DNA sequence: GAATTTCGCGACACAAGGCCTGGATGTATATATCTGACACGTGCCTGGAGACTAGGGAGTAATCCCCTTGGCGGTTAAAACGCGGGGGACA
Protein backbone atom coordinates (compact mmCIF):
# COMPACT_ATOMS: atom_id res chain seq x y z
CA UNK A 1 0.00 0.00 0.00
CA UNK A 2 2.96 2.27 0.72
CA UNK A 3 6.14 2.65 -1.30
CA UNK A 4 9.49 2.30 0.45
CA UNK A 5 10.25 5.96 -0.25
CA UNK A 6 7.04 6.82 1.61
CA UNK A 7 8.15 4.97 4.75
CA UNK A 8 11.68 6.36 4.49
CA UNK A 9 10.33 9.91 4.44
CA UNK A 10 7.79 9.25 7.21
CA UNK A 11 10.14 7.59 9.70
CA UNK A 12 12.39 10.55 10.50
CA UNK A 13 11.98 14.34 10.52
CA UNK A 14 12.50 16.04 7.17
CA UNK A 15 15.23 18.42 8.31
CA UNK A 16 17.06 19.40 5.12
CA UNK A 17 15.80 16.73 2.71
CA UNK A 18 15.60 17.78 -0.96
CA UNK A 19 12.17 18.03 -2.54
CA UNK A 20 13.03 14.92 -4.56
CA UNK A 21 12.74 12.83 -1.39
CA UNK A 22 8.96 13.28 -1.09
CA UNK A 23 6.85 10.27 -1.92
CA UNK A 24 5.45 10.65 -5.42
CA UNK A 25 8.00 13.25 -6.56
CA UNK A 26 10.69 11.91 -8.87
CA UNK A 27 13.43 13.50 -10.92
CA UNK A 28 11.30 15.33 -13.49
CA UNK A 29 8.71 16.67 -11.06
CA UNK A 30 11.48 17.51 -8.62
CA UNK A 31 13.29 19.57 -11.23
CA UNK A 32 10.09 21.35 -12.23
CA UNK A 33 9.40 22.21 -8.58
CA UNK A 34 12.95 23.46 -8.10
CA UNK A 35 12.50 25.77 -11.08
CA UNK A 36 9.14 26.93 -9.70
CA UNK A 37 10.78 27.78 -6.37
CA UNK A 38 9.91 24.98 -3.96
CA UNK A 39 13.49 23.68 -3.81
CA UNK A 40 13.37 22.07 -0.36
CA UNK A 41 11.09 19.44 1.17
CA UNK A 42 10.05 21.66 4.08
CA UNK A 43 8.99 24.28 1.54
CA UNK A 44 6.45 21.83 0.14
CA UNK A 45 5.52 21.02 3.73
CA UNK A 46 4.79 24.68 4.41
CA UNK A 47 2.77 24.95 1.21
CA UNK A 48 0.78 21.94 2.43
CA UNK A 49 0.20 23.53 5.83
CA UNK A 50 -0.93 26.91 4.47
CA UNK A 51 -3.72 25.12 2.61
CA UNK A 52 -4.98 23.98 6.03
CA UNK A 53 -4.08 20.32 5.39
CA UNK A 54 -6.90 20.12 2.82
CA UNK A 55 -6.70 17.27 0.33
CA UNK A 56 -8.29 18.50 -2.90
CA UNK A 57 -6.75 21.97 -2.71
CA UNK A 58 -3.24 20.59 -2.27
CA UNK A 59 -3.68 18.02 -5.04
CA UNK A 60 -4.92 20.69 -7.44
CA UNK A 61 -2.06 23.00 -6.48
CA UNK A 62 0.52 20.26 -7.09
CA UNK A 63 -1.03 19.45 -10.45
CA UNK A 64 -1.02 23.13 -11.40
CA UNK A 65 2.58 23.75 -10.32
CA UNK A 66 4.52 20.76 -11.68
CA UNK A 67 1.83 18.90 -13.63
CA UNK A 68 1.78 15.63 -11.72
CA UNK A 69 -1.05 13.20 -12.34
CA UNK A 70 -3.51 11.72 -9.86
CA UNK A 71 -1.23 9.07 -8.40
CA UNK A 72 1.86 11.19 -7.78
CA UNK A 73 -0.13 13.95 -6.10
CA UNK A 74 -2.03 11.41 -4.00
CA UNK A 75 1.21 9.81 -2.81
CA UNK A 76 2.77 13.18 -1.97
CA UNK A 77 -0.31 14.31 -0.05
CA UNK A 78 -0.53 11.05 1.88
CA UNK A 79 3.14 11.08 2.86
CA UNK A 80 2.90 14.71 3.98
CA UNK A 81 -0.21 14.04 6.06
CA UNK A 82 1.43 11.08 7.77
CA UNK A 83 4.57 13.11 8.49
CA UNK A 84 2.44 15.86 10.03
CA UNK A 85 0.54 13.37 12.18
CA UNK A 86 3.83 11.80 13.30
CA UNK A 87 5.90 14.89 14.11
CA UNK A 88 3.67 17.97 14.10
C1' DG B 1 122.10 50.28 -84.47
C1' DA B 2 118.74 49.18 -88.44
C1' DA B 3 115.49 45.98 -90.21
C1' DT B 4 112.34 42.09 -89.81
C1' DT B 5 109.24 40.16 -87.03
C1' DT B 6 105.49 38.36 -82.99
C1' DC B 7 102.23 39.97 -79.39
C1' DG B 8 99.00 43.19 -78.27
C1' DC B 9 95.68 47.41 -79.36
C1' DG B 10 91.86 49.62 -81.87
C1' DA B 11 88.49 49.36 -85.46
C1' DC B 12 85.45 46.28 -87.65
C1' DA B 13 82.61 42.70 -87.32
C1' DC B 14 79.34 39.51 -85.27
C1' DA B 15 76.20 37.53 -81.79
C1' DA B 16 72.89 37.50 -77.74
C1' DG B 17 69.94 39.54 -74.23
C1' DG B 18 66.80 43.11 -73.01
C1' DC B 19 63.64 46.57 -74.24
C1' DC B 20 60.43 49.52 -77.58
C1' DT B 21 56.44 49.14 -81.06
C1' DG B 22 52.84 47.56 -83.72
C1' DG B 23 49.56 44.11 -85.82
C1' DA B 24 46.34 40.04 -85.42
C1' DT B 25 43.63 38.16 -82.69
C1' DG B 26 40.19 37.43 -79.47
C1' DT B 27 37.41 39.44 -75.70
C1' DA B 28 34.12 42.43 -73.66
C1' DT B 29 30.35 46.12 -74.95
C1' DA B 30 26.81 49.02 -77.01
C1' DT B 31 22.96 48.92 -80.15
C1' DA B 32 18.94 46.64 -82.35
C1' DT B 33 15.59 42.75 -83.31
C1' DC B 34 12.12 39.00 -81.91
C1' DT B 35 10.46 34.75 -80.27
C1' DG B 36 8.96 31.36 -77.24
C1' DA B 37 8.97 30.61 -72.55
C1' DC B 38 7.77 32.44 -68.14
C1' DA B 39 4.03 34.87 -65.65
C1' DC B 40 -0.66 35.77 -64.63
C1' DG B 41 -5.95 34.66 -64.70
C1' DT B 42 -9.92 31.29 -64.21
C1' DG B 43 -12.84 26.58 -63.41
C1' DC B 44 -13.20 23.09 -60.51
C1' DC B 45 -12.46 19.58 -57.69
C1' DT B 46 -9.89 16.81 -54.75
C1' DG B 47 -7.43 17.23 -50.78
C1' DG B 48 -6.83 19.61 -46.52
C1' DA B 49 -9.28 21.47 -42.32
C1' DG B 50 -12.45 20.84 -38.29
C1' DA B 51 -15.09 18.39 -34.60
C1' DC B 52 -15.46 14.07 -31.83
C1' DT B 53 -14.39 9.54 -29.84
C1' DA B 54 -11.73 5.43 -28.19
C1' DG B 55 -7.72 3.51 -26.87
C1' DG B 56 -3.07 2.48 -26.76
C1' DG B 57 1.61 4.55 -26.32
C1' DA B 58 4.42 7.03 -23.63
C1' DG B 59 5.57 9.57 -19.41
C1' DT B 60 6.86 9.15 -14.85
C1' DA B 61 7.83 7.03 -10.38
C1' DA B 62 9.85 2.75 -7.62
C1' DT B 63 13.40 -0.68 -7.23
C1' DC B 64 17.45 -4.02 -8.21
C1' DC B 65 21.68 -4.75 -9.36
C1' DC B 66 25.50 -4.52 -12.43
C1' DC B 67 29.04 -2.43 -14.14
C1' DT B 68 31.53 1.78 -14.63
C1' DT B 69 34.59 4.73 -12.29
C1' DG B 70 38.70 5.36 -9.10
C1' DG B 71 42.48 3.84 -6.47
C1' DC B 72 46.56 1.07 -5.22
C1' DG B 73 51.03 -1.80 -5.85
C1' DG B 74 54.00 -4.29 -8.82
C1' DT B 75 55.84 -5.71 -12.98
C1' DT B 76 57.95 -5.44 -16.49
C1' DA B 77 56.87 -4.35 -22.04
C1' DA B 78 57.26 -0.69 -24.37
C1' DA B 79 58.42 4.25 -25.21
C1' DA B 80 62.26 7.99 -25.39
C1' DC B 81 66.53 9.47 -26.59
C1' DG B 82 71.01 9.63 -28.84
C1' DC B 83 74.14 8.24 -32.29
C1' DG B 84 76.29 6.48 -36.60
C1' DG B 85 75.41 5.71 -41.29
C1' DG B 86 73.75 4.67 -45.97
C1' DG B 87 70.15 4.57 -49.06
C1' DG B 88 66.70 7.44 -50.76
C1' DA B 89 64.76 12.22 -52.18
C1' DC B 90 65.79 15.90 -55.01
C1' DA B 91 67.99 18.61 -58.44
UniProtKB/Swiss-Prot annotation:
Cellular component per GO, a single term: nucleoplasm
UniProt keywords, alphabetically: Acetylation, Chromosome, Cytoplasm, Disease variant, DNA-binding, Host-virus interaction, Nucleus, Osteoporosis, Phosphoprotein
Effect recorded for residue 53 to E: Reduces binding to dsDNA
Protein's name according to its UniProt entry: Barrier-to-autointegration factor
Result after altering residue 32 to E: No effect on histone H1/H3 binding
Main location per the UniProt record: nucleus
GO molecular function: DNA binding; double-stranded DNA binding; identical protein binding; protein homodimerization activity
Quaternary structure note: Homodimer. Heterodimerizes with BANF2. Interacts with ANKLE2/LEM4, leading to decreased phosphorylation by VRK1 and promoting dephosphorylation by protein phosphatase 2A (PP2A). Binds non-specifically to double-stranded DNA, and is found as a hexamer or dodecamer upon DNA binding. Binds to LEM domain-containing nuclear proteins such as LEMD3/MAN1, TMPO/LAP2 and EMD (emerin). Interacts with ANKLE1 (via LEM domain); the interaction may favor BANF1 dimerization. Interacts with CRX and LMNA (lamin-A). Binds linker histone H1.1 and core histones H3. Interacts with LEMD2 (via LEM domain).
Annotated HhH domain residues: 19-34
SUPFAM superfamilies hit by this protein: Barrier-to-autointegration factor, BAF
Consequence the record notes for mutating residue 31 to E: No effect on histone H1/H3 binding
Effect listed in the UniProt record for changing residue 7 to A: Enhances histone H1/H3 binding
N-acetylthreonine PTM positions: 1
Domain of life: Eukaryota
Function as written in the Swiss-Prot or TrEMBL entry: Non-specific DNA-binding protein that plays key roles in mitotic nuclear reassembly, chromatin organization, DNA damage response, gene expression and intrinsic immunity against foreign DNA. Contains two non-specific double-stranded DNA (dsDNA)-binding sites which promote DNA cross-bridging. Plays a key role in nuclear membrane reformation at the end of mitosis by driving formation of a single nucleus in a spindle-independent manner. (Microbial infection) Exploited by retroviruses for inhibiting self-destructing autointegration of retroviral DNA, thereby promoting integration of viral DNA into the host chromosome. EMD and BAF are cooperative cofactors of HIV-1 infection. Association of EMD with the viral DNA requires the presence of BAF and viral integrase. The association of viral DNA with chromatin requires the presence of BAF and EMD.
Tissues and organs where the protein is expressed, per its UniProt entry: Widely expressed. Expressed in colon, brain, heart, kidney, liver, lung, ovary, pancreas, placenta, prostate, skeletal muscle, small intestine, spleen and testis. Not detected in thymus and peripheral blood leukocytes.
Effect recorded for residue 5 to E: Complete loss of dsDNA and LEMD3/MAN1 binding
Modified residues (Phosphothreonine): 1-2
One Pfam family of this chain: SAM_BAF
Organism the protein comes from: Homo sapiens
